[PDB]
Design an enzyme around this catalytic site. Sequence first.
Site, short mmCIF file in Angstrom:
data_model
loop_
_atom_site.label_atom_id
_atom_site.label_comp_id
_atom_site.label_asym_id
_atom_site.label_seq_id
_atom_site.Cartn_x
_atom_site.Cartn_y
_atom_site.Cartn_z
N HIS A 1 -0.87 5.96 16.02
CA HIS A 1 0.27 5.15 15.42
C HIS A 1 1.57 5.43 16.22
O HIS A 1 2.08 6.44 16.21
CB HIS A 1 0.46 5.34 14.17
CG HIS A 1 -0.79 5.03 13.31
ND1 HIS A 1 -0.90 3.88 12.70
CD2 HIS A 1 -1.70 5.62 13.09
CE1 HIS A 1 -2.08 3.70 11.99
NE2 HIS A 1 -2.64 4.86 12.22
N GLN B 1 3.77 1.70 2.97
CA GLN B 1 3.55 0.70 3.85
C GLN B 1 3.81 -0.69 3.65
O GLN B 1 3.68 -1.15 2.26
CB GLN B 1 1.75 0.68 4.15
CG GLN B 1 1.28 -0.12 5.18
CD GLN B 1 -0.11 -0.17 5.61
OE1 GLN B 1 -0.64 0.95 5.53
NE2 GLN B 1 -0.71 -0.86 6.23
N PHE C 1 4.96 1.52 8.48
CA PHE C 1 5.06 2.64 7.27
C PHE C 1 6.01 3.82 7.32
O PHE C 1 6.65 3.89 8.33
CB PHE C 1 3.60 3.30 6.95
CG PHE C 1 3.02 3.95 8.03
CD1 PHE C 1 2.33 3.47 9.13
CD2 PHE C 1 3.18 5.39 8.08
CE1 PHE C 1 1.91 3.92 10.22
CE2 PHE C 1 2.49 6.00 9.29
CZ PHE C 1 2.00 5.56 10.16
N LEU D 1 -1.77 11.52 12.70
CA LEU D 1 -1.62 10.28 13.12
C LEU D 1 -0.90 10.21 14.57
O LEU D 1 -1.16 9.07 15.26
CB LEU D 1 -0.89 9.42 12.21
CG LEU D 1 -1.35 9.38 10.67
CD1 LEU D 1 -0.37 8.18 9.94
CD2 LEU D 1 -2.79 8.59 10.58
N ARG E 1 0.99 -1.20 0.01
CA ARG E 1 -0.12 -0.03 -0.19
C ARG E 1 0.92 1.08 0.12
O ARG E 1 1.69 1.56 0.98
CB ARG E 1 -0.72 0.06 1.07
CG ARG E 1 -1.94 1.02 1.41
CD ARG E 1 -2.72 0.81 2.64
NE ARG E 1 -3.52 2.05 2.79
CZ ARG E 1 -3.77 2.92 3.70
NH1 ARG E 1 -2.97 2.78 4.91
NH2 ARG E 1 -4.77 3.91 3.66
N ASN F 1 -1.64 -0.13 12.18
CA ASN F 1 -2.71 -0.86 13.12
C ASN F 1 -4.00 -0.88 12.52
O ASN F 1 -4.25 -0.45 11.82
CB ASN F 1 -2.30 -0.23 14.32
CG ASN F 1 -2.88 1.20 14.60
OD1 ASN F 1 -3.88 1.32 14.30
ND2 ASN F 1 -2.18 1.98 15.20
N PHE G 1 1.88 10.70 1.24
CA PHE G 1 1.55 10.29 2.66
C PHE G 1 2.33 9.28 3.07
O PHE G 1 3.33 9.65 3.77
CB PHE G 1 -0.01 9.77 2.24
CG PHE G 1 -0.76 8.99 3.39
CD1 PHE G 1 -0.40 9.49 4.77
CD2 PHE G 1 -1.77 8.33 3.47
CE1 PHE G 1 -1.03 8.92 5.98
CE2 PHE G 1 -2.04 7.61 4.42
CZ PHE G 1 -2.05 8.33 5.65
#
Length: 164
Positions: free
Chosen positions: A125, A62, A112, A121, A54, A101, A59
């Site tokens: 995270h 991942q 990531f 975040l 991903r 998560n 951004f």
Amino acid sequence: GNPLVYLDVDANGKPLGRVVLELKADVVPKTAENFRALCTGEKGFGYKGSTFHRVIPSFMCQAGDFTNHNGTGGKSIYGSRFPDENFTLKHVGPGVLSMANAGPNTNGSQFFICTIKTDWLDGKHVVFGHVIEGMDVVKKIESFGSKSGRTSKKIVITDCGQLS
Ligand SMILES: CCOC(=O)CNC(=O)NCc1ccc(N)cc1
């Protein structure tokens, strides 16, 4: 002091180079140690041969699902999941390394690397490291992502381990 670990990355079988990460074991020892051991493969399982599944431009990138290869799986060296250690480190900018998560206290192996400041975040995270060298390799990985997260090339961690 803090471990240095590396990921060598391929895109469709062609090497992109190496990413070197500092793990902040001084702040999050349990989280750092999990990632370290999964890079060495010393428990009999780990990141070698897994993919960045991903990737979303502007951004993050991942990776780390070595059981299901699709963002649903992975496990830690302690068990399936382990708790959020602390939220002391923040997502300050590009190169931040953080745990993926599925809600509170669901850390496994998925992680990531941020390509921008992801401040929303913070507190959700667990940040546990940063890129020392190879942000160019990360920007290349990012260029193969899309809004949906689907990658336009297969991105494989072909080797990994500990440098110190
Ligand atoms: C920018 C961070 O984005 C996420 O973490 C979105 N969540 C995500 O992909 N969740 C799937 C998942 C399942 C099991 C474990 N252990 C970890 C993650």
